[PDB]
Design a protein around this ligand. Structure first.
Ligand code: 4BF
Length: 307
């Protein structure tokens, strides 16, 4: 894989790929991701951080926006407590091996120019579109607040992207990013990462849903979570165990089993794994055993540093 293919690997879309190729030619390029700070950092976060690390390996300067004001607007609590969750997230991201600059949103998002741009964009953005943009992001609320529609307009504020060539986020961000594509004065390449399925297979992985493996989970804990996880024989779609295998594991993968079940299996790619599992040659228990043990090893250094 050249740089472009490394970056493209395991993303859901790049907007646009011709734009990304132009960016890669530059000496200096920057990529941004924002996160509302989360009390637990989970594999969904890790997947994206891994992508920022790809970008870093591709010579991008990395910026992590600790989106405290956004989290505030999205009902995650008071700013001071959010910022301390932010500082913890920074430690986790550093433990994952990311080399980045960290910025707290509230550092600049209360500046007069930033605020003026919020209001200018507020004039340009329909309520309907703002609300549509937040469907996968907004905290559940029986009586949606004005804060909900301020959030996306802040996210499209041009002062977040000045000197940034690439923005990365989950596919949940795509409607907001489409807003930005249309409104931003200077185009920024969007790279969208896939959204992991929840361990119970019931919806998307999320902090509020308690359906994820946190990167600092004890090995006992990871094993129990994976043991209970949705993982029907033969089915790859919406199978979180297969997702973990696709997104986190290295190949060739050596799947240890009893000789009773075929004995050790060596698989040279995720697509190879996909065919075996789909053909019912690899049973969920062994796939889970392998995924849990490889995942524990993957996360070990991170859990260890957070010690
Ligand atoms: N919308 C992202 C947070 C975010 C992302 C990007 C900016 Br700019 C501001 C905030 C959230 O879902 O984590």
């Amino acid at each position: 894989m050249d740089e472009f293919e490394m970056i493209k690997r395991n993303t859901s879309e790049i907007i646009s790929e011709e734009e990304l190729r132009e960016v890669l030619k530059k000496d200096e390029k920057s990529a941004l991701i924002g996160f509302e700070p989360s009390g637990k950092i989970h594999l969904g976060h890790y997947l994206q951080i891994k992508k920022m690390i790809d970008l870093q390996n591709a010579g991008f300067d990395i910026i992590i926006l600790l989106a405290d004001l956004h989290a505030y607007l999205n009902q995650k609590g008071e700013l001071d407590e959010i910022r301390k969750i932010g500082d913890y997230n920074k430690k986790v991201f550093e433990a994952m091996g990311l080399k980045a600059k960290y910025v707290y949103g509230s550092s600049f998002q209360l500046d007069k120019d930033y605020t003026l741009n919020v209001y200018r964009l507020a004039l340009k953005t329909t309520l309907k579109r703002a609300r549509r943009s937040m469907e996968l992001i907004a905290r559940e609320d029986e009586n949606p607040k004005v804060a909900e529609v301020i959030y996306p307009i802040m996210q499209v504020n041009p002062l977040h992207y000045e000197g940034v060539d690439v923005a990365v986020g989950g596919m949940e961000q795509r409607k907001i990013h489409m807003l930005a594509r249309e409104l931003l004065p200077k185009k920024v390449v969007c790279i969208h990462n896939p959204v992991l399925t929840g361990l119970d297979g019931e919806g998307k992985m999320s902090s509020s849903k308690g359906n994820f493996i946190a990167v600092d989970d004890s090995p006992e804990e990871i094993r129990a979570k994976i043991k209970k996880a949705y993982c029907p024989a033969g089915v790859v779609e919406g199978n979180p165990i297969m997702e973990i295998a696709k997104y986190f594991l290295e190949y060739p993968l050596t799947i240890k089993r009893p000789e009773k079940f075929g004995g050790d299996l060596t698989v040279n790619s995720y697509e190879e794994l996909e065919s075996l599992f789909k053909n019912k040659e690899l049973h969920p228990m062994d796939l889970k055993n392998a995924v849990a043990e490889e995942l524990i090893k993957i996360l070990e250094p991170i859990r260890k540093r957070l010690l």
